[PDB]
Design a protein around this motif. Structure first.
Motif, PDB file in Angstrom:
ATOM      1  N   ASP B 528       0.814  -1.205   0.000  1.00  0.00           N
ATOM      2  CA  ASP B 528       0.000   0.000   0.000  1.00  0.00           C
ATOM      3  C   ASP B 528       0.849   1.257   0.000  1.00  0.00           C
ATOM      4  OD1 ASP B 528      -1.618   2.161   0.448  1.00  0.00           O
ATOM      5  OD2 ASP B 528      -2.920   1.162   1.812  1.00  0.00           O
ATOM      6  N   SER B 530      -0.453   4.320  -1.160  1.00  0.00           N
ATOM      7  CA  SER B 530      -1.390   5.403  -1.423  1.00  0.00           C
ATOM      8  C   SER B 530      -1.106   6.646  -0.594  1.00  0.00           C
ATOM      9  CB  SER B 530      -2.806   4.934  -1.172  1.00  0.00           C
ATOM     10  OG  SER B 530      -3.213   4.009  -2.147  1.00  0.00           O
ATOM     11  N   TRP B 557      -1.765  -0.958  -4.150  1.00  0.00           N
ATOM     12  CA  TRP B 557      -2.642   0.191  -3.987  1.00  0.00           C
ATOM     13  C   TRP B 557      -1.892   1.485  -4.253  1.00  0.00           C
ATOM     14  CZ3 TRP B 557      -7.573  -1.278  -3.314  1.00  0.00           C
ATOM     15  CH2 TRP B 557      -7.801  -2.513  -2.787  1.00  0.00           C
ATOM     16  N   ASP B 585      -5.048  -0.706  -7.931  1.00  0.00           N
ATOM     17  CA  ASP B 585      -5.835   0.507  -7.754  1.00  0.00           C
ATOM     18  C   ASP B 585      -5.079   1.749  -8.183  1.00  0.00           C
ATOM     19  OD1 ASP B 585      -7.423   2.589  -7.068  1.00  0.00           O
ATOM     20  OD2 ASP B 585      -7.546   2.160  -4.983  1.00  0.00           O
ATOM     21  N   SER B 587      -6.706   4.705  -8.813  1.00  0.00           N
ATOM     22  CA  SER B 587      -7.664   5.784  -8.647  1.00  0.00           C
ATOM     23  C   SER B 587      -7.002   7.064  -8.162  1.00  0.00           C
ATOM     24  CB  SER B 587      -8.740   5.369  -7.669  1.00  0.00           C
ATOM     25  OG  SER B 587      -9.403   4.218  -8.117  1.00  0.00           O
ATOM     26  N   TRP B 614      -9.165  -0.750 -10.491  1.00  0.00           N
ATOM     27  CA  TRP B 614      -9.892   0.441 -10.085  1.00  0.00           C
ATOM     28  C   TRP B 614      -9.351   1.655 -10.816  1.00  0.00           C
ATOM     29  CZ3 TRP B 614     -13.826  -0.202  -6.430  1.00  0.00           C
ATOM     30  CH2 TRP B 614     -13.819  -1.398  -5.768  1.00  0.00           C
TER      31      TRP B 614
END
Ligand SMILES: Nc1ncnc2c1ncn2[C@@H]1O[C@H](COP(=O)(O)OP(=O)(O)OP(=O)(O)O)[C@@H](O)[C@H]1O
Ligand SMILES: CC(C)(O)c1coc(S(=O)(=O)NC(=O)Nc2c3c(cc4c2CCC4)C=CC3)c1
Lengths: 284, 816
Positions: B528, B530, B557, B585, B587, B614
């Motif tokens: 992760d 993000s 992510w 992801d 996004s 995503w």
């Protein structure tokens, strides 16, 4: 469409063009419109109080708007104007239709992922700043929850006040069993003992919990108002996961959600904590 | 006809002529204030020592209190000392303040009572200053209180009797709090310097502080220190070459104290005609090296010193008298020995006390005490008080203990340590870690990263590899090179971590190491990254490491990371060879139509096993649907696609639908959320629903279909081959006019499990209609939304009745 009248500023709807409805309250409707004088997108709050209050009773609503118009902060939705025409109350507000906290929470739920603590503080600290601004001027919000928390494309938090027209529904509390969302309400608000500044703190704590948990602390399946009130009065709600969130975050929630109305922290305290936490997890 | 300001400024200039703040400066040398090397200062562009109290950007809000924070050894006190001198010299804030009062935290009692005589004790020699005159006037004065964490004794924040009026004598803690809260001599300015750990007990007292972080030396400044320290460039070059060879020590030297210790050690080695070898890797190794070099050329006094240090920690004593030295069996010859050797200071600044050259050294000796051969000598009590301010947090005592407790022992005094104890301690530390690893902390004392620092110091693979088994999830917030190095070490030796969360802070394309380590992990499953500044340059480096055969990453992510369309090239390259990645992801990035078009290549590429993608809020338009639709047709592995919050209007959807319609497509979920769709798109959606039986979840919330869209969508949904289980219809600009068709759906479809109706004007009648019809052997198992809707009593009652009468509807959901 009425002709433009720049000489009357923002004191008439003739100077705005409604493109669509964007929301609805119980005492008001919210429309998305552009200003015809300067091209600026605005939020129009249409309040219908004439069927509820006469010219005398209506006066009680003046203080609330006159006070709100004095606010000025990057994390607060700006008030531009207010006027009455065609037997309707029209308030011009800064538009923030980029998105909100509610949408963010729904997004995380779909991903079956929890919001990183470094991403919780990112938005939480901004909300706290907005509230500090309001409280230092003795302005209470009275409706803090994801619905009124707007997020810009750049990730900037702006606190709105749309709610359900609570500023007008001050003497009709009998309707509040249906009008309002009593998940963010302190025991004192439930008991209608008056809404103090520390009650914004309660609701702020609730919001923080909800973000971390992706659910309200007093949520339940087929839970009625009676049982909901009991859970709130007893401050009975599930803990946050110890390996996902820091101790400090949990402590902040515990301090905010305090069934004893005199033992809550003020906004300055909470804000300073949010800053110090954020400062250690603040990505550049 | 004489003022006092001049007398004081002269005094201040006189007392702060040397950094060492004393005589016996390594042969009575001059410290030379020009020795001062600029430290990096970052405001919570660089910030100067000047203008710290200036009003902010809007409404000109003035600053009375400025708080500096930083790690021990960074130079918190040297900065304050420099400030005192620059002011006294008339160069810094010479117009803003008439007097500055510098007070050491270690020199002030928190248990005795006194008036605010600190302004007198810190004044020129004149015992009777004009304290009641201009010196009394707030705002014309600034207090400097450094070493908040060095305060000795218990300290509380919850003080009722705050006590104003400087003329009144009161307890030191109350007096200090009153000053910090600006209750005493209000409108006066205050500068505080503290270790981050003590913020826990400081932030409560600040009200409206300005914060600045003090950072260590840059590479360039580290070099300057060596060349300014060693006046003989030949020696400076030797010293610099040696530190460059020892890269690990070089990294640690970002802390001025560390480079000082190294330089001091080397200076001695030079004087003694030694080879100047320096093989230290850890902080402990450096301290052991230093002590060995200074003292080995003995244990009779070392034991006594360790006893003294340990006592001082538990009894909160920094400044010792001759009677304390005697109590530990230390007198005359050895005391002198540690003054000729730079181990102890004599606090010659109007004092008769002895102390350690640095608080870290005191903790080092106290740590050493526990391993030799009497406040306790217990480890359990030591660890129990780890989180206690009242004991000084014991951070270095424990950190050193970790380094000292090793099987890879050396000689030179170290032979005095008891292996029996070392073994006992090692085991206790493992148990301690297991406990501290279970409960995340950010600003306490344990802090995840801090545990890694402890593991780093104890360079023992068996120990660390066992300790790492207690961290199934690792969340870190790296700042400097030292953090990256420590993290890399701990992670590399971890075989039980599934989730890595990197909250990269600030001071990109240097990280390397960590990513190189992550790619070799065998247990790591989720990465992760993000909500941090992983701009394209960082993504490129990561992508290179993500092509490693052993990556084993299942989920990646990369949300609001500030990625641009360019990064999709590198991501595509990962997709084309990394057969382990399942969910990606991207996004909240700027991966517009071009960016996605590139990604489509990686997605179409053979052996791309990505199942979940995503792409929310990715600045896409309907134009890109031409390539994405091909991905859906081409790639059998992609089943979950979320493209909401983009400019994909009815035409975009129709393109995707044309291919999604093909019954051989495996698409299961469509995140067509805030796509701005109208009832027109429902034709295309209907065709897909009636054709593609692999679709189970369709999200249309955020669109504006109206009742017409519902009717058209229903025609598709009512088809016998529609297998859709979940339909999400939040505010779709619906009215009660559509309730007839939704009602029809509820009692007609069989495959539908959930119908989520959000903020729309379904109406009271609409809901009551649903209640009556849903009772007729409905196949629905889930709720009907109905959130953010207003209902009257009868409607609410009818809804509640449904909830009670038909319990198979586990959830129904009233908005109340
Ligand atoms: N900016 C600097 N320029 C030159 N030398 C420095 C600097 N900072 C620290 N030093 C070196 O480090 C040694 C110790 O510095 P210092 O006493 O300030 O550590 P400290 O942690 O700030 O002490 P304290 O914890 O009480 O604030 C000094 O003797 C000096 O050699
Ligand atoms: C989380 C984090 C980075 O470990 C931290 C942040 O702040 C603290 S501190 O308050 O305990 N100070 C220190 O550790 N100084 C310090 C450090 C090292 C080596 C030495 C010292 C003191 C002289 C030898 C290695 C980095 C920290 C720790």
């Amino acid at each position: 469409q009425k002709a433009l009248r720049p000489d009357m500023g923002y004191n008439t709807l003739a100077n705005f063009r409604i493109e669509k409805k964007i929301g609805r309250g119980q005492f008001s409707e919210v429309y998305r419109a552009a200003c015809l004088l300067d091209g600026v997108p605005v939020a129009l709050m249409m309040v219908q109080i004439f069927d509820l209050m006469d010219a005398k009773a209506r006066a009680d609503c003046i203080k609330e708007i006159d006070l709100l118009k004095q606010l000025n902060h990057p994390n607060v939705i700006k008030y531009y104007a207010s006027f009455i025409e065609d037997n309707e109350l029209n308030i011009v507000l800064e538009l923030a239709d980029a998105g909100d906290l509610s949408r963010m929470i729904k997004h995380f739920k779909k991903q079956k992922r929890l919001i990183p603590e470094r991403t919780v503080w990112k938005y939480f600290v901004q909300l706290c700043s907005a509230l500090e601004h309001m409280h230092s001027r003795r302005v209470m919000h009275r409706d803090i929850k994801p619905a009124n928390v707007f997020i810009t494309a750049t990730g900037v938090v702006k606190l709105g006040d749309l709610g359900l027209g609570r500023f007008f529904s001050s003497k009709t509390t009998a309707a509040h069993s249906l009008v309002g969302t009593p998940y963010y309400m302190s025991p004192e608000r439930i008991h209608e003992n008056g809404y103090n500044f520390k009650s914004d703190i309660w609701s702020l704590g609730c919001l923080l919990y909800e973000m971390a948990a992706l659910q309200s602390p007093f949520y339940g399946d087929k839970m009625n108002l009676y049982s909901l009130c009991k859970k709130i009065e007893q401050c009975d709600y599930p803990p946050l996961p110890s390996d996902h969130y820091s101790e400090e975050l949990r402590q902040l929630v515990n301090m905010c959600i305090n069934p004893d109305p005199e033992k809550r922290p003020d906004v300055t305290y909470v804000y300073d904590v949010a800053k110090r936490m954020h400062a250690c997890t603040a990505s550049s | 006809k004489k003022d006092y300001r001049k007398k004081y400024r002269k005094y201040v200039r006189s007392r702060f002529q040397c950094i060492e703040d004393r005589n016996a400066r390594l042969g009575e040398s001059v410290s030379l204030n020009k020795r001062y090397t600029r430290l990096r200062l970052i405001k919570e562009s660089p910030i100067k020592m000047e203008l710290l109290f200036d009003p902010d950007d809007e409404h000109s809000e003035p600053v009375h209190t400025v708080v500096f924070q930083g790690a021990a050894g960074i130079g918190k006190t040297i900065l304050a000392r420099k400030m005192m001198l620059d002011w006294a010299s008339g160069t810094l804030y010479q117009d803003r303040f008439d007097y500055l009062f510098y007070i050491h935290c270690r020199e002030v009692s928190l248990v005795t009572q006194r008036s605010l005589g600190d302004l007198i004790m810190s004044c020129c020699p004149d015992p009777n200053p004009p304290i009641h005159k201009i010196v009394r006037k707030p705002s014309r004065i600034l207090f400097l209180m450094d070493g908040f964490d060095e305060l000795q004794g218990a300290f509380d924040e919850h003080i009722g009797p705050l006590c104003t009026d400087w003329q009144k004598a009161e307890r030191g803690d109350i007096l200090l709090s009153s000053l910090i809260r600006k209750k005493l001599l209000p409108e006066a300015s205050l500068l505080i310097t503290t270790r981050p750990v003590a913020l826990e007990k400081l932030q409560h007292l600040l009200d409206h502080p300005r914060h600045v972080e003090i950072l260590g030396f840059s590479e360039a400044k580290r070099k300057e220190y060596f060349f300014k320290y060693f006046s003989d460039e030949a020696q400076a070059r030797a010293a610099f070459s040696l530190i460059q060879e020892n890269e690990v020590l070089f990294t640690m030297c970002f802390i001025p104290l560390v480079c000082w210790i190294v330089c001091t050690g080397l200076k001695q080695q030079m004087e003694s005609g030694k080879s100047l070898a320096q093989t230290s890797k850890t902080t402990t190794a450096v301290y052991v090296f230093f002590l060995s070099s200074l003292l080995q050329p003995l244990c009779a006094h070392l034991w006594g010193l360790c006893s003294l240090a340990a006592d001082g920690i538990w009894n909160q004593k920094i400044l010792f008298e001759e009677s304390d030295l005697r109590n530990h069996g230390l007198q005359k010859a050895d005391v002198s020995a540690f003054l000729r050797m730079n181990l102890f200071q004599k606090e010659v600044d109007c004092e008769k006390f002895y102390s350690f050259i640095h608080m870290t050294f005191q903790e080092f000796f106290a740590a050493m005490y526990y391993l030799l051969e009497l406040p306790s000598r217990d480890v359990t009590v030591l660890l129990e008080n780890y989180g206690k301010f009242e004991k000084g947090y014991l951070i270095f005592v424990v950190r050193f203990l970790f380094g000292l407790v090793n099987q890879e022992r050396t000689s030179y005094l170290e032979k005095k340590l008891s292996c029996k104890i070392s073994q006992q301690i090692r085991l206790e530390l493992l148990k301690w870690i297991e406990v501290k690893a279970k409960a995340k902390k950010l600003q306490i004392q344990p802090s995840q990263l801090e545990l890694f620092y402890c593991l780093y110091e104890m360079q023992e693979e068996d120990f660390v590899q066992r300790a790492m088994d207690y961290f199934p999830k690792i969340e870190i917030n790296l700042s400097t090179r030292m953090d990256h190095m420590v993290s890399s070490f701990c992670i590399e030796n971890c075989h039980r971590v599934e989730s890595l969360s990197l909250g990269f802070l600030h001071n990109s394309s240097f990280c390397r190491g960590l990513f190189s380590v992550l790619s070799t992990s065998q247990s790591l499953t989720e990465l992760d990254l993000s909500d941090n500044s992983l701009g394209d340059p960082g993504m490129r480096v990561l992508c290179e490491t993500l092509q490693h055969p052993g990556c084993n990453i299942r989920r990646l992510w990369l949300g609001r990371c500030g990625l641009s369309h360019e990064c999709c090239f590198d991501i595509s390259l990962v997709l084309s060879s990394n057969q382990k990645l399942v969910e990606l992801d991207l996004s909240d990035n700027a991966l517009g139509d071009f960016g996605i078009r590139l990604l489509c290549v990686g997605l179409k590429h053979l052996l791309c096993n990505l199942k979940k993608l995503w792409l929310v809020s990715c600045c896409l338009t309907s134009a890109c649907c031409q390539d994405l639709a091909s991905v859906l047709s081409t790639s059998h592995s992609l089943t979950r696609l979320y493209v909401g919050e983009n400019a994909l209007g009815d035409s975009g959807v129709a393109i995707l639908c044309e291919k999604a319609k093909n019954p051989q497509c495996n698409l299961q979920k469509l995140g067509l959320v805030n796509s701005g769709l109208t009832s027109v798109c429902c034709s295309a959606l209907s065709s897909v629903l009636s054709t593609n039986q692999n679709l189970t979840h369709l999200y249309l919330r955020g669109n504006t279909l109206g009742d017409k869209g519902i009717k058209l969508l229903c025609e598709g949904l009512l088809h016998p081959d529609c297998k859709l289980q979940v339909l999400e219809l939040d505010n779709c600009n619906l009215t009660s006019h559509c309730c007839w068709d939704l009602s029809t759906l509820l009692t007609s479809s069989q495959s539908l499990r959930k119908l989520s109706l959000g903020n729309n004007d379904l109406g009271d009648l609409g809901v009551m209609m649903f209640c009556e019809v849903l009772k007729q052997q409905s196949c629905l198992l889930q709720n009907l939304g109905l959130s953010e809707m207003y209902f009257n009593y009868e409607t609410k009652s009818a809804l509640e009745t449904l909830q009670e009468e038909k319990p198979e509807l586990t959830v129904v959901f009233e908005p109340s």
